[PDB]
Enzyme design. Structure first.
Site, PDB file in Angstrom:
ATOM      1  N   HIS A   1       8.937 -13.118   2.464  1.00  0.00           N
ATOM      2  CA  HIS A   1      10.209 -13.504   3.069  1.00  0.00           C
ATOM      3  C   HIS A   1      10.642 -14.890   2.613  1.00  0.00           C
ATOM      4  O   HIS A   1      11.754 -15.076   2.100  1.00  0.00           O
ATOM      5  CB  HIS A   1      10.070 -13.455   4.589  1.00  0.00           C
ATOM      6  CG  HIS A   1      11.325 -13.776   5.344  1.00  0.00           C
ATOM      7  ND1 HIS A   1      11.891 -15.032   5.359  1.00  0.00           N
ATOM      8  CD2 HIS A   1      12.086 -13.013   6.164  1.00  0.00           C
ATOM      9  CE1 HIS A   1      12.961 -15.024   6.131  1.00  0.00           C
ATOM     10  NE2 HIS A   1      13.103 -13.810   6.631  1.00  0.00           N
TER      11      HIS A   1
ATOM     12  N   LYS B   1       5.398   0.796  -3.134  1.00  0.00           N
ATOM     13  CA  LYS B   1       6.570   0.058  -3.594  1.00  0.00           C
ATOM     14  C   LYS B   1       6.632  -0.033  -5.123  1.00  0.00           C
ATOM     15  O   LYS B   1       7.598   0.423  -5.748  1.00  0.00           O
ATOM     16  CB  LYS B   1       6.526  -1.333  -2.966  1.00  0.00           C
ATOM     17  CG  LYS B   1       7.736  -2.186  -3.171  1.00  0.00           C
ATOM     18  CD  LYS B   1       7.658  -3.385  -2.213  1.00  0.00           C
ATOM     19  CE  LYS B   1       6.877  -4.580  -2.769  1.00  0.00           C
ATOM     20  NZ  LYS B   1       7.725  -5.394  -3.731  1.00  0.00           N
ATOM     21  N   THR B   2       5.588  -0.614  -5.731  1.00  0.00           N
ATOM     22  CA  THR B   2       5.467  -0.643  -7.190  1.00  0.00           C
ATOM     23  C   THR B   2       5.444   0.752  -7.801  1.00  0.00           C
ATOM     24  O   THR B   2       6.191   1.026  -8.749  1.00  0.00           O
ATOM     25  CB  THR B   2       4.221  -1.424  -7.609  1.00  0.00           C
ATOM     26  OG1 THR B   2       3.093  -1.006  -6.816  1.00  0.00           O
ATOM     27  CG2 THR B   2       4.437  -2.913  -7.572  1.00  0.00           C
TER      28      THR B   2
ATOM     29  N   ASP C   1       0.827  -1.231   0.000  1.00  0.00           N
ATOM     30  CA  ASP C   1       0.000   0.000   0.000  1.00  0.00           C
ATOM     31  C   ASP C   1       0.854   1.271   0.000  1.00  0.00           C
ATOM     32  O   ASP C   1       0.339   2.297  -0.414  1.00  0.00           O
ATOM     33  CB  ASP C   1      -1.022  -0.029   1.128  1.00  0.00           C
ATOM     34  CG  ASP C   1      -2.166  -0.977   0.857  1.00  0.00           C
ATOM     35  OD1 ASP C   1      -2.595  -1.054  -0.294  1.00  0.00           O
ATOM     36  OD2 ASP C   1      -2.612  -1.613   1.802  1.00  0.00           O
TER      37      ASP C   1
HETATM   38 MG   LIG Z   1       8.960  -4.011  -7.376  1.00  0.00          MG
END
Ligand SMILES: [Mg+2]
Ligand SMILES: [Zn+2]
Ligand SMILES: [Zn+2]
Ligand SMILES: [Zn+2]
Ligand SMILES: [Zn+2]
Ligand SMILES: [Zn+2]
Ligand SMILES: [Zn+2]
Lengths: 260, 359
Positions: B50, B16-17, B13
C-alpha cells in the site's frame, strides 16, 4: 458434498475464517462431523504456518503501552494496516506491559485472554496466510517517555522509542525521543561502547596517532545520544540541553520495522 | 490505439503473478509487463504494498485506469482483501473487476457462487459497482492449454475491454503550456516556449498567462512555431514557441503557464500529499519540522513556500510519506492533483501532489 450441505461449509468457514475449499475438504475428511472438521482445520493451519516459517517479515508495526515496547512483523503492509493485525498487536503489547516478561520467549507464553501470545499469533497467521513474528520486546520499570512514528500516514507506527528517565521536565524527555527516533543513536554514553567495537572502528581507520583519534571523536558523535547535535538546535548538544532541563536519561531503546 | 493502465491487486499466494503470465500467454497465442488486445494496449501496474504504491502514484511513476482483483476461488477473500480494495478506493481507481483464480479446483459450484457474493459485498462495502464483472479463471490450467480455461482468461480480458472505460486523451483536455524560455524575435514580437502539457492551441486563439507575476495576463497567440517552421496548431506533447501579441519580454517568465482562458487559476496556499526522499536515496539527512521553508518545483520553476505540519505530526523524517500545508511567497498556477517537486537549493529532496487548494 458427501454428508453435509453447502450451508454447512459456509458456516464452518464463517467460524474458523479458513478457506472455503479447505473447509469443504475438512468436512468431507471427517464425513460431516462438524466438530472434528474444526479441529481438522487447526491441523492444516499449523502445517501451513510451519511451511511459511522461513519466509521474510519486513513489514509490520511497533506498539507501546505503559513502558512496554514490542515489534510485530508480517509480510505485506496490507496486513500491517489491517484491523485484525493491529488488534493482535494491541493485545500482545498489553500482555507484555502487565507481565513484564524477561525475554521474548517469556512474552510468547503470556496470556492474552483464553489463549497465549504464541497461540494468538499462530492462529491469526493461519487465517491471513502470511508469516507473523513477535520480533522484539522491551520493558522499562521506571518513568518513561514514548514516541511512536509513522513512516506513512495511513499505516501503523514503524519506528518506536522508549526513554526511561529521572526529572520533571516531561517535554524535555519527549524531545529526546524524537532525537533518538530521528538520528538512530546506538549508545547512551561514550563508556557504553564495547571495546571490541572500538577496535573494529580504529582498525578501519588504519585501512583508510591523531587521525585515529579524530575518527573516533566523529563516530562517537554519530552513535552516542549524548554526543549528538540536538535536532531542534544543532548549535547545542543533547547532553547540554538535558542539563538545562533538569532531566537525566537512565536508558532508552528504538525499534524500527524492517531495519535493525 | 489507446494505451490503458490496469493494476492487478491481490494476495501473492492466490496467483496474482501466475494469472498475469497466463494473460500474456493467452494473448500471445492469439497474436503471434505490456499486453494488448483488439481495442487497446494494456500496461500492467502492480501494488505489492500500500504505502509504496502511494509513493509511486505521488511521483507519477504509477497510475491505474482500472484494476483486476485476484481472489482464489479455493480460498475466497482474506482479511487483507478489505485493505487491497481500500487502496483502490483511496487512490481512486475508476472501475474494478475480479478474477476468481484457481476455479478448476472447486468441483461443487455452490461454493463458487458463494465466494462471488463475499467478493461482491466487499466491492459494495467500499462504493464499487456491486454487480461488476467477476470472472472464473484458472491461470494454471490455461497455461497448460485447457481450452475450457483458456477461454476463461479470454473472457476476463474481454471483460476488461468492455468494462474499463477509455481514458481521456490529453488533446481533449483544456490547453496548458508551462513557459520555459522567453525571447524576442526581432520585428515579430516576443515568443514563449515550452512543451504543450495538455490540449491543443491554434494559430489565432486567445490565451491567459497565469502565475508567478501578480496579475494574470490575457492576450492572443500570433504564431505557433515548431522547429523553426510555423504551424497552424500545437498538440499536447509538442515542443513549441508561441508568439504573443504586444507582450514585452520582461512581462512573462518561466513558471508561468499559458492556458485556454478561464481554465486555470493561480493559487498561493494548498494542502498536499508528499513523499520525502531518504538519505540513501539522496535526500535530507535530518528530519524537518513545523516551520520548514524549501522551494516547490511545480512545472518549470521553483517557488519558495513554508510548510505547516498537520495536528499530530511532530516531525517529518527522510523516507516519510505524509501530508502538509504550504503557503507560497508568490502565486503559482495549480489544480488539484498537480505534481510538484520539493527542492532545497535545486536538489530534489521530495515529491508531492496537490490535494486541496486554499486562497
Ligand atoms: Mg503483477
Ligand atoms: Zn465434492
Ligand atoms: Zn478473546
Ligand atoms: Zn510526550
Ligand atoms: Zn503500446
Ligand atoms: Zn495493437
Ligand atoms: Zn546525502
Amino acid at each position: 458434498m458427501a454428508n453435509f450441505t453447502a450451508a454447512d461449509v459456509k458456516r464452518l468457514r464463517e467460524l474458523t475464517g479458513a478457506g472455503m475449499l479447505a473447509c469443504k475438504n475438512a468436512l468431507a475428511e471427517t464425513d460431516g462431523d462438524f466438530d472434528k472438521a474444526v479441529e481438522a482445520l487447526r491441523i492444516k493451519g499449523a502445517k501451513d504456518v510451519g511451511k511459511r516459517a522461513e519466509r521474510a517479515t519486513a513489514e509490520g508495526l511497533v506498539a507501546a503501552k505503559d513502558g512496554a515496547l514490542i515489534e510485530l512483523n508480517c509480510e505485506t503492509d496490507f496486513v500491517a494496516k489491517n484491523a485484525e493485525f493491529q488488534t493482535l498487536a494491541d493485545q500482545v503489547v498489553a500482555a507484555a506491559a502487565a507481565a513484564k516478561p524477561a525475554d521474548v520467549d517469556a512474552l510468547k507464553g503470556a496470556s492474552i485472554g483464553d489463549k497465549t501470545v504464541e497461540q494468538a499469533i499462530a492462529e491469526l497467521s493461519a487465517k491471513i496466510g502470511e508469516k507473523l513474528e513477535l520480533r522484539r520486546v522491551a520493558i522499562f520499570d521506571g518513568t518513561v517517555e514514548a514516541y511512536l512514528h509513522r513512516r506513512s500516514a495511513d499505516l501503523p507506527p514503524a519506528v518506536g522509542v522508549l526513554v526511561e528517565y529521572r526529572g520533571d521536565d516531561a517535554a524535555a524527555a519527549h524531545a529526546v525521543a524524537l532525537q533518538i527516533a530521528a538520528l538512530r543513536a546506538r549508545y547512551l554514553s561514550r563508556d557504553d561502547v564495547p571495546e571490541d567495537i572500538v577496535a573494529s572502528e580504529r582498525r578501519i581507520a588504519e585501512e583508510t596517532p591523531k587521525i585515529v583519534e579524530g575518527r573516533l571523536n566523529g563516530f562517537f558523535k554519530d552513535a552516542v545520544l549524548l554526543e549528538q547535535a540536538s535536532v531542534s538546535d544543532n548549535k547545542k548538544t543533547v547532553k547540554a540541553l538535558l542539563d538545562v532541563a533538569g532531566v537525566t536519561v537512565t536508558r532508552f531503546v528504538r525499534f524500527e520495522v524492517g531495519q535493525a | 490505439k489507446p494505451h490503458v493502465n490496469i493494476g492487478t491487486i491481490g494476495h501473492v499466494d492466490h496467483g496474482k503473478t501466475t494469472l498475469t503470465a497466463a494473460i500474456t500467454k493467452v494473448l500471445h497465442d492469439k497474436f503471434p509487463v505490456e499486453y494488448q488486445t483488439d481495442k487497446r494496449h494494456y500496461a500492467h501496474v502492480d501494488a505489492p504494498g500500500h504505502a509504496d504504491y502511494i509513493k509511486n502514484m505521488i511521483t507519477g511513476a504509477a497510475q491505474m485506469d482500472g484494476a483486476i482483483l485476484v481472489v482464489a476461488a479455493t480460498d475466497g477473500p482474506m482479511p487483507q482483501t478489505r485493505e487491497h480494495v481500500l487502496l483502490a478506493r483511496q487512490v481512486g481507481v475508476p472501475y474494478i473487476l475480479v478474477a476468481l483464480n484457481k476455479a478448476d479446483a472447486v468441483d461443487d459450484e455452490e461454493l463458487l457462487e458463494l465466494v462471488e457474493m463475499e467478493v461482491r459485498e466487499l466491492l459494495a462495502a467500499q462504493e464499487f459497482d456491486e454487480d461488476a464483472p467477476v470472472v472464473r479463471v484458472s491461470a494454471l490450467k490455461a497455461l497448460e492449454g485447457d481450452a475450457k480455461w483458456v477461454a476463461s482468461v479470454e473472457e476476463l480480458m474481454n471483460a476488461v475491454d468492455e468494462s474499463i472505460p477509455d481514458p481521456v486523451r490529453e488533446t481533449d483536455k483544456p490547453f496548458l503550456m508551462p513557459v520555459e524560455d522567453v525571447f524576442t524575435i526581432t520585428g515579430r514580437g516576443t515568443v514563449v516556449t515550452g512543451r504543450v502539457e495538455r490540449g491543443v492551441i491554434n494559430v489565432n486563439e486567445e490565451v491567459e498567462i497565469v502565475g508567478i507575476r501578480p496579475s494574470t495576463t490575457k492576450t492572443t497567440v500570433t504564431g505557433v512555431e515548431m522547429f523553426r517552421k510555423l504551424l497552424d496548431q500545437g498538440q499536447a506533447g509538442d515542443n513549441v514557441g508561441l508568439l504573443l501579441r504586444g507582450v514585452k519580454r520582461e512581462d512573462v517568465e518561466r513558471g508561468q503557464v499559458v492556458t485556454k482562458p478561464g481554465t486555470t487559476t493561480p493559487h498561493t496556499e494548498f494542502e498536499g500529499q508528499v513523499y520525502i526522499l531518504s538519505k540513501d536515496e539522496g535526500g535530507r539527512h535530518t528530519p524537518f519540522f513545523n516551520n520548514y521553508r524549501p522551494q516547490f518545483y511545480f512545472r518549470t520553476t521553483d517557488v519558495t513556500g513554508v510548510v505547516t505540519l498537520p495536528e499530530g505530526t511532530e516531525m517529518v523524517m527522510p523516507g516519510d510519506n505524509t501530508n502538509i500545508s504550504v503557503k507560497l511567497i508568490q502565486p503559482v498556477a495549480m489544480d488539484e492533483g498537480l505534481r510538484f517537486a520539493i527542492r532545497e537549493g535545486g536538489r530534489t529532496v521530495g515529491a508531492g501532489r496537490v490535494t486541496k487548494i486554499i486562497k
